[model samples]
Target: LGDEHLLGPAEYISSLPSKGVREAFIDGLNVWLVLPDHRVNQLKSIAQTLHNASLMLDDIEDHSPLRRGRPSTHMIFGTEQTINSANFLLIDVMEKVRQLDDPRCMDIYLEEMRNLFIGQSFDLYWTRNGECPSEEQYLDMIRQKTGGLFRLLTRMMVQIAPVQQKGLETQLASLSDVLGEFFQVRDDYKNLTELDECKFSYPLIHALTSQPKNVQLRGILQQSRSAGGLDVPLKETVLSHLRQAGSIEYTEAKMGELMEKITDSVVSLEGET
Candidate 1:
C-alpha cells in the first residue's frame, strides 16, 4: 500500500552486491562532460535504479533462482509481486528523469527503453525456440539490449553538459556498443564456468553453430530447457563439449578484442574532449 511495500522487490535486488560498473561508467564519462556534482549523482542514481529494476524482471523471465548468490527477488517476493514492483520502479524512475526538467530526456529515455525491449525480445525468441543466432545477430542484440542503458546515460550527459561538440554523440555511441558487447560476452564466459542455467550465451552460440552436425550441446540445452535448469552432471558435460568445440577459447579471444576496442574508444573520446 505504501511506497516501502511496493518497492520491496526492487530494493531487495538493489541491496545485493554490484560490480558498480554503471556508477563507474557515469563517473568515467563525467570527466569529459563535466556535469556538476549534484547532476552527476542524480544521473548515477537513475541509472542504478533502472538497472536493478531490469534485473528483477530479468530474473523473473529467466526463472532464475538466485541473484548475487542469494535467492532472487522474485523467488522471495513471488513472481506476481516482483513483476509489479519492477514495473512500478520503471515508472518511478521515469518520474525521476522528468524531474530533470529536460523534455529531451524523456525522448532519450523512451527511445532507449524501446530498443532494450526489442533486443530482449529477440533474445527470448531465440531461447524459447531453441534456436541459436549467428554471432553477428547476438552482437546486434547486445548492442540494443545492453548498449541501450549506456547510450542513454551518455546521451543524457551530452544533452545536459555545458560542453557539446559535433560527432560526440556518434563517438560515444560506438563506445557504448563496445562496452555492451564486452560486458555480455564476459558474463557469458563466467556463466559457463560457473555452470549457470543454460541460456543463449556467446560461447554457447558458438558451440551450437561451429559444428551443426554435433548436436550434443544443443541436446543438453534442450534438456536444460525442459527440466527448467541444468543439473551438475549435465553442466559438466556441457562444459566439456564447449572445451572440445573450442568455444571457451574463442570467447576469451573475442573478449580480448572487445576490451581492446573499449580502450581505443575511450582514448579516442578523451582526445576529442
Candidate 2:
C-alpha cells in the first residue's frame, strides 16, 4: 500500500484518494498473483498504472480539480502533461501485454480495452446533453463505462483459475461484476449528495431534469443571468429552491434503494450452492 515498491517512469503521489484506490486494486491483484506466476504482479502493476492514467483523463473531462481528496492530476501536472502521461501509460500497456505467452488472453484483454473507451465515449455524451436521466438510464451509462471493466477484469481473473474451476468462471465473474457496479453506483450517489464545492451541484442536476423539480429550478435558471455562461446568483437560487424542495435528498434516497436491490441480487447469487 505504501509507495516503496514501485520503480516506474513516474512516481505516484500519496496525496490522492484515487491513489489509494489504485493501491487497493494492486494489492488485491497481488493476492491472486501470489499463487504462483510472477506475471500477475507485473500485469497488475500495469493495471494500476492504466487505472490512474484513466483518472487523469477523467479529471480533465470532468474539469474536476480534486483527485484522491486533493488537486487532480492535471491541476498539479498541467492538462497537456497529464494527457501526455496518460498516453504514455496506455502505450506501455500494449507493449507489455503483447509479450504475453498466452495469445487468447492477449486478444481478450485488448478487446476489453476497446470496450473501456467505448463506454467512456457514451459517458461523455451523456454528461454533455445537460440532463441526467432516470435511474435506469444512468445505470445503463454506468454499465457501459464503469461496470463493464470491473466485469471484464473479473472474467480475466476467473479465466486464469485452474482448468478444474473453469466451468464456474463466467458465472462467478458475472455475479461479482454486477456487485461491483452496485458499489460503484453507491459511491457516485454518495458523491452527488455530497457534491463538494464544485461549480455544478448534483441536486441542481436532478432539479434540471426531474419533471416536478424542473418547475422550480427552471424558473430560477431563467431568472438568473450573467455576462458569463452561468449566473452564480441564479444557480444558488435554484440550489436553494431544490434544497427547500428536497430534490437532492430524493435522488440520494433513490440511489440508496438501488443499492439495496443490487445487494439482494448479489446475495442470491452468493447463496447458490
Candidate 3:
C-alpha cells in the first residue's frame, strides 16, 4: 500500500487539496470544528475515504492523466486496481457511516451520500446519451451531483448543533453549492472562446432555450463547439460566447442576485444571526 505513492506521500498529499474544497471545509468547520470525538472520528474516516473515492471516480470519468499532477490512480496502479481501490474506499466509508448512532443526523447523511452516486450516474448517462440537458436541467443535476455531498457533511456535523446553528449548516452547503455552480458556469464561460475544450455551461442550454429571433445569440453557439472535456481552449470559447451573447454579463448579474438571495436566506434562517 505504501508503494501506492509513486512520487512520495509528502509530495502527493501536500498538493492534493484544491483551493475550493479547502475553503468549503474551513467555512463549514466553523459551525462545528470540534465535533464529538465519536462523530468527529467517524466523519473524518468517512469524508477522507469518500473523498479519495471521488478523486478516483473523477479521474476515470474524465480520463484524466494526472491527479495532483501525479499520474492518476489508474496510471500508477493499473486501471483495474484504481477502480477496485475506489470501490473499497467507498464501501469502507459507507459502512462506517451506516453504523453511526446519531439518528438525528445519520439519515440525512446516508441519504445524500447515496444520492451523490446516483446523481453522478445520471450525469454520465445523460452525457453518453448525447442529451443536451438545458441549463435548468444542468442546475438540477448539480443540485444532486455536487450539492448532495456538501449537503451531507454540513447536515451531519450540525445535526445536534446549537439552536443558533440550525440553518447555518444548510446555508453553508448552499453557499458551497452556489460557488461550485458559479465556477461551473465560469467553466462554461471559458469554453465559448476556445476550440479544444468542451461547451458545457450556458451555451448548450442557451442553444436549447433561445428564441429563433435571437439570431445573433444563436450564432455564438453555432461556431463554438467542443464535444470533449473542459480544457483551457474550451474555457476561452465559453468566456467568448458569454461576452458575445450578453449572456456573460447577464450571468454575472445573475450570480450576484443569487448570492444576495443566499445571504438573505441563510442569515435569517438561524435564530442567532
Candidate 4:
C-alpha cells in the first residue's frame, strides 16, 4: 500500500493496530470515569493515537521485527516514513487535544508524556548497558511508564465528569500505581518462564541481587544480556537456578498477592462509584 494511502485519515491509521491482545487501558478508564452516558470517542481517539505512535517508535528503537505479531511499521513502510508517520500522528493528536481549549486536559497529556519518556529512558539505559536495576527502581519505572498512563486517563476523565468523591482521585492514582507494577512483574515472570529471554526482569533482578548473591545467576544474566539471548546450556543452567532459588514460585506468589490487592481496590472503587 502507498504510504500516503496507508496513513489515510489520522485516527484511522493510528487505530490500525487496535485489533489485538493489548490491554485496553482506555476501556478501563471508561469504567473508572463512571459515566455510563459519556461520549468516550475522543478519549479513545487520544489513547489509540498515542499508543500506536509509541509502538511504531519502539519497534524502530528496539530493532524489533514484529509489532502486534506482524511486520513492524518500519519494516513495512521503511524507517524514514515510519518515523515521519508516527511523529505526524502524535502532533495531530496533540493538536486535536489543543483545539479542545482545555488547558487542564493538555497539561495532563504533556505531563504523562514526559513520564513515559522518563520511564523509557531508564528501561533503555539498563538494557543497553546490561545493568541489573534494583527492584525499587524497576517498580518506579513501571509506576511512571504504565501507571502514569492509567492515571492520566482516569484523572482526566474524573475531572471532566462530575464525580465528587473526596479522595477518589488519590485512591485511583494509588490503584494505577499498583496495577502498573503488577503488570510489569507479571510480564517479567512470563519472560523468564515462557520466553526465557533472560533480559533483566523483576524476578531475575531479585534472584541475582539477593543478600548472599547468586553468582551463577548473575553470570548467566550477563551472558544473556550481552549476547541478546542465552545459549542452550546457559538457559538450562539459569532455569535450574531460578527453580532451585524458588524465584519462580516466589514470583507466582507475588503476582497473586498483587492481583488480590488490585481486585480489592477495583471492587472498592466500583462499590462506591
| Candidates ranked by TM-score | 1, 4, 3, 2
**Candidate 2 ranges beyond 4 A from true positions:** 1-37, 195-213, 219-273
lDDT of 3 by residue, 1-273 (tens): 664533332223335655456335635565444456566656665666666677677767776687666677566556666666666665566577677766565577668877787878878876455456776777877777766665676676676454555546655677667755655566555544332222245555664455436555344443443335445554465455455556666566656776776677557654355
- Compared with the true structure, the alpha-carbon lDDT of candidate 1 equals 0.85
Question: What digit string (tens of lDDT, one per residue) describes model 1 on residues 31-126?
Answer: 777788988988998999989988888888877777778899977879999888888888888888988879999999999999999999998898
Which pairs of residues have clashing backbones in candidate 2? 16-68, 17-68
Off by over 4 Å in 4: 1-25, 31-38, 99-101, 163-167, 195-198, 211-213
lDDT of 2: 0.56
Each candidate structure's TM-score, on Cα atoms with residue i matched to residue i, is 0.94, 0.70, 0.71, 0.84
RMSD of 3: 5.0
Comparing 2 and 3 on lDDT, the stronger one: 3
What Cα-based lDDT does every candidate model obtain? Answer: 0.85, 0.56, 0.59, 0.71
Can you tell me which runs of candidate 3 are displaced by over 4 Å?
1-17, 20-29, 32-34, 98-100, 103-106, 162-180, 186-199, 211-242, 269-273
Better of 1 and 3 by lDDT: 1
Per-residue error (Å), model 3, residue 50: 2.1
Question: lDDT of model 2 at residue 66?
Answer: 69
Best by lDDT: 1
Which scores greater on TM-score, model 2 or model 3? 3
Order the candidate numbers by lDDT, best to worst: 1, 4, 3, 2
TM-score attained by model 1: 0.94
